[PDB]
Write a protein that binds this DNA or RNA. Structure first.
Ligand SMILES: [Mg+2]
Ligand SMILES: [Mg+2]
Ligand SMILES: [Mg+2]
Ligand SMILES: [Mg+2]
Ligand SMILES: [Mg+2]
Ligand SMILES: [Mg+2]
Ligand SMILES: [Mg+2]
Ligand SMILES: [Mg+2]
Ligand SMILES: [Mg+2]
Ligand SMILES: [Mg+2]
Ligand SMILES: [Mg+2]
Ligand SMILES: [Mg+2]
Ligand SMILES: [Mg+2]
Ligand SMILES: [Mg+2]
Ligand SMILES: [Mg+2]
Ligand SMILES: [Mg+2]
Ligand SMILES: [Mg+2]
Ligand SMILES: [Mg+2]
Ligand SMILES: [Mg+2]
Ligand SMILES: [Mg+2]
Ligand SMILES: [Mg+2]
Ligand SMILES: [Mg+2]
Ligand SMILES: [Mg+2]
Ligand SMILES: [Mg+2]
Ligand SMILES: [Mg+2]
Ligand SMILES: [Mg+2]
Ligand SMILES: [Mg+2]
Ligand SMILES: [Mg+2]
Ligand SMILES: [Mg+2]
Ligand SMILES: [Mg+2]
Ligand SMILES: [Mg+2]
Ligand SMILES: [Mg+2]
Ligand SMILES: [Mg+2]
Ligand SMILES: [Mg+2]
Ligand SMILES: [Mg+2]
Ligand SMILES: [Mg+2]
Ligand SMILES: [Mg+2]
Ligand SMILES: [Mg+2]
Lengths: 22, 146, 56, 124, 77, 100, 48, 59
RNA sequence: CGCGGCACAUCCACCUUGUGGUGGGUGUGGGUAGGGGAGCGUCCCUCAUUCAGCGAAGCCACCGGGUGACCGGUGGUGGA
RNA sequence: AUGCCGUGGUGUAAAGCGUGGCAGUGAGACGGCGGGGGAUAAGCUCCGUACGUCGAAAGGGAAACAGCCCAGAUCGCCGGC
RNA sequence: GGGUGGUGAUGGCGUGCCUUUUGAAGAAUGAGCCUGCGAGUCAGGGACAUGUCGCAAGGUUAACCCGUGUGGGGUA
């Protein structure tokens, strides 16, 4: 589940503004 | 046509950096910049500008005790389970110059030119360096006020 | 005049079985992609006379 | 009217292979492989003609900043200083005179320092 | 699995509701509110309809109002 | 002595007798152009002031209209069948500067 | 005088024929059919 | 009195009403500026596209 | 944004004021399926014209040219 | 609250509408917001949304990274913001 | 010193082509290479719509006949 959680958490970057595909 | 340095336009000097109380990261940035030649207006990323840098008193670089205990240097031999762990603290006892040089090398660009760049770096644990045949000018770390 | 794939000599059998040979399926040795095969949309005998009106 | 294709067909092949001279492997020998690499080459050239405008200005700023901190000013504040002083010399020539005429560059630093506000850090 | 499709059917949506709003100019015969029952009541110059459709007897402007609790649609000529 | 002369939305450092390639001017071969300066350096003096260098102009002589290198564009997108072929030759002017 | 080579069709009388399936710069590979279904290879009868 | 509206953010990703309101002010691209009278219609337009423009009471 | 080149649409003013040209504005010019428009190259025929054993075609090299398909020049090879 | 219908002003070239010729499409994806199904699981599934992007969108940012953020590439520039 | 032409130390950027897909550099398909060949064509007084030309309240012939022809007749 680590890969999923890390991919999901990388929306929380300033450049992404809390939003990211999938 | 923007100036591009020729072969032979590069004049190289020699600096000595005293590492006696310098934070290791500050020292490494200064050494990398000075040894690349970012400080000279003739700089070109495809050219070996930059001067020779001798770091002395590498044994007493400023590394906080928490880093000396916890910051680990990792080396994989390529064999299974061949990850070897050392600690900054014990590389300070065995090869402190290796600690300083590893910091510099990490700051350097990861490319072929940096392989020649790092050839102009000497790091010494003690207060003495053998390169007195030149006249290596001391270089202190300064910050330009803004 | 040219000769379409149906008017070209031979070409009746399927040259080999559809599956298993490792080759492209072909259907006929006289298919247009074959050398010596039929011509696709080739010239056929035509009459080019037009019906221009008399007073024209 | 049956038309042989070769006379017309070979024209674009000659052009593609001539443009592909110097390529290594099949990319300079084979028209099909040279054509793919020509699409990449012209895409790359188009990309890099507008990328070099940032590349050269990156290099100009690097050199300008190096010269500025030989004259004890950051590029940060030297650009303010020239703006405020009204100096509209672009970084092409700023870097090029930082190399060719360092004394003139020092003069420009002096005027930039003068034009800088006394407290560069307080609100305006 | 359970064949719990015991409830998967529905009727067509009948497109009910107000068709001409207040202050809107309409011609005679033009339906103003198609609805079930008398959700709105026929006012002056408005006919009701066999299925409670509230058409316009005369041309003019639609207006909505209240007539003793009952809400009504009328046309002012 | 040299000056930083502005022309064609760009600017170049030139010294008297320099041949410079610039954007196309509406001036035939042989006639003069006067061009504004962004900076003049006369050795140790710069003077770097907008009012001061509004009144100095770099004088140039049009040696001819030349034509830049042939740029060959073939815009290509991957799996679409898109192809756009263009060429382009920028029109330039050569000036011998005799002014400052 | 008016010769055989002074003779010329009226403007707009002779329009060019669209040659389909002749490269990407024109009506290219699928020749305007765009499709993968019936229309890609056949005609649909008007009565269907 | 007389407002001065400059478009500072793209219409890329903007809703219908924002794009059409920018069109109605006559704004075309980034750092386009238009001058329009300060009436209720203009301030409604500016309110719709407030985040895409900056305005000043410029004569 | 600046400077220069191109294109499309549309508008305004001169020229046989619509076959339309010229100048200047204004806007526009990412693009798959797809629509519309305009062209390049090959071959054959006709008409006119012009090259060709003092060397055509084809091919090769080099130098040039056009917004693209592509084109031209020169030389070599060659032989209609 | 929005949204919707009408209406009067204002603004806005490439709005709209009718009628013909020629289409393609009718496998969508993710993200935001509102919901169903699911276990208020799924990079799940099914709807809504003059919502967006991708599709069919290059460039910049997000290490890399269709669908997120910025921004829509006519060409050229060794100019600037 | 300058410019051609060849090469290219070194720095940056940079995920083949096609098909087909929501999405492929894809570890989905096809292609070893080159040369040659290989896919919206033709017929019909067909049908619809258009561009253009002739004649115009008319227009036009079909078979056929006569002509070395592409021309002239030919009203069904
Ligand atoms: Mg047979
Ligand atoms: Mg068969
Ligand atoms: Mg045969
Ligand atoms: Mg006859
Ligand atoms: Mg090479
Ligand atoms: Mg830029
Ligand atoms: Mg119901
Ligand atoms: Mg009844
Ligand atoms: Mg695609
Ligand atoms: Mg293809
Ligand atoms: Mg289809
Ligand atoms: Mg399909
Ligand atoms: Mg297909
Ligand atoms: Mg386009
Ligand atoms: Mg654009
Ligand atoms: Mg298309
Ligand atoms: Mg002879
Ligand atoms: Mg000879
Ligand atoms: Mg021939
Ligand atoms: Mg040639
Ligand atoms: Mg020749
Ligand atoms: Mg020859
Ligand atoms: Mg279906
Ligand atoms: Mg479906
Ligand atoms: Mg859906
Ligand atoms: Mg939801
Ligand atoms: Mg899904
Ligand atoms: Mg959604
Ligand atoms: Mg993108
Ligand atoms: Mg990007
Ligand atoms: Mg990146
Ligand atoms: Mg800036
Ligand atoms: Mg698709
Ligand atoms: Mg799939
Ligand atoms: Mg593959
Ligand atoms: Mg592979
Ligand atoms: Mg498959
Ligand atoms: Mg294979």
């Amino acid at each position: 589940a680590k890969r999923g959680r890390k991919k999901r958490d990388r929306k929380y970057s300033k450049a992404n503004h809390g939003k990211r595909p999938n | 046509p923007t100036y591009a340095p020729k072969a032979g336009d590069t004049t190289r000097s020699w600096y000595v950096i005293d590492a006696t109380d310098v934070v290791l990261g500050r020292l490494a940035v200064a050494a990398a910049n000075l040894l690349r030649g970012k400080h000279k207006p003739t700089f070109a990323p495809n050219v070996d500008g930059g001067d020779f840098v001798i770091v002395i008193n590498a044994d007493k670089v400023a590394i906080s005790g928490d880093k000396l205990q916890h910051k680990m240097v990792y080396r994989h031999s390529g064999y299974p389970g061949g990850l070897h762990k050392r600690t900054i603290g014990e590389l300070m006892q065995r090869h402190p110059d290796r600690v300083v040089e590893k910091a510099i090398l990490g700051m350097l660009p990861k490319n072929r030119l940096s392989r020649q760049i790092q050839r102009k770096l000497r790091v010494y644990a003690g207060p003495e360096h053998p390169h007195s045949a030149q006249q290596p000018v001391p270089y202190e770390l300064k910050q330009v006020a803004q | 005049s040219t000769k379409t794939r149906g008017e070209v000599s031979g070409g009746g059998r399927k040259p080999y079985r559809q599956k298993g040979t490792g080759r492209a399926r072909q259907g006929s040795t006289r298919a247009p992609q074959f050398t010596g095969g039929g011509v696709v949309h080739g010239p056929k005998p035509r009459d080019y006379s037009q019906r221009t009106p008399k007073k024209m | 009217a049956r038309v042989k294709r070769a006379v017309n067909a070979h024209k674009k092949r000659r052009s593609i292979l001539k443009a592909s001279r110097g390529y290594r492997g099949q990319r300079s020998r084979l028209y099909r492989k040279a054509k793919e690499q020509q699409l990449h080459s012209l895409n790359y050239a188009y990309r890099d003609r507008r990328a070099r405008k940032g590349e050269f200005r990156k290099l100009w700023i690097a050199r300008i900043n190096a010269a500025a901190r030989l004259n004890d000013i950051t590029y940060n504040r030297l650009i303010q200083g020239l703006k405020a002083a009204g100096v509209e010399v672009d970084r092409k020539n700023l870097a090029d005179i930082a190399i060719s005429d360092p004394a003139a560059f020092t003069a420009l630093v002096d005027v930039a320092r003068a034009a800088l506000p006394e407290d560069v850090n307080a609100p305006s | 699995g359970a064949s719990s499709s015991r409830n998967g059917r529905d009727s067509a949506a009948q497109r009910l509701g107000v068709k001409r709003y207040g202050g809107q100019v309409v011609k005679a015969g033009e339906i103003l509110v198609r609805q079930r029952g008398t959700k709105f009541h026929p006012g002056v110059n408005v006919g009701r309809g066999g299925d409670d459709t509230l058409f316009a007897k005369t041309a003019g402007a639609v207006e909505f109002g209240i007539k003793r609790g009952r809400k009504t649609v009328s046309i002012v000529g | 002595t040299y000056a930083i002369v502005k022309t064609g939305g760009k600017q170049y450092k030139v010294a008297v007798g320099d041949v410079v390639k610039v954007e196309k001017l509406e001036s035939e071969q042989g006639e003069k152009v006067s061009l504004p300066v962004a900076l003049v350096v006369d050795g140790a003096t710069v003077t770097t002031d907008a009012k001061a260098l509004a009144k100095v102009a770099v004088t140039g002589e049009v040696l001819g209209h030349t034509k830049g290198p042939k740029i060959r564009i073939h815009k290509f997108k991957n799996k679409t069948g898109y192809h756009k072929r263009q060429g382009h030759r920028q029109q330039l002017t050569v000036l011998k500067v005799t002014g400052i | 005088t008016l010769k055989l080579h002074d003779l010329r069709p009226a403007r707009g009388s002779k329009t060019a024929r669209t040659r389909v399936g002749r490269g990407d710069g024109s009506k290219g590979k699928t020749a305007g059919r765009g499709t993968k279904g019936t229309r890609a290879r056949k005609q649909v009868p008007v009565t269907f | 009195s007389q407002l001065k509206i400059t478009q500072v953010r793209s219409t890329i990703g903007a809703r219908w009403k924002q794009r059409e309101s920018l069109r109605t002010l006559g704004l075309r691209r980034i750092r386009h500026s238009v001058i329009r009278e300060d009436n209720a219609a203009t301030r409604g337009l500016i309110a719709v596209v407030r985040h895409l423009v900056e305005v000043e009471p410029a004569q």
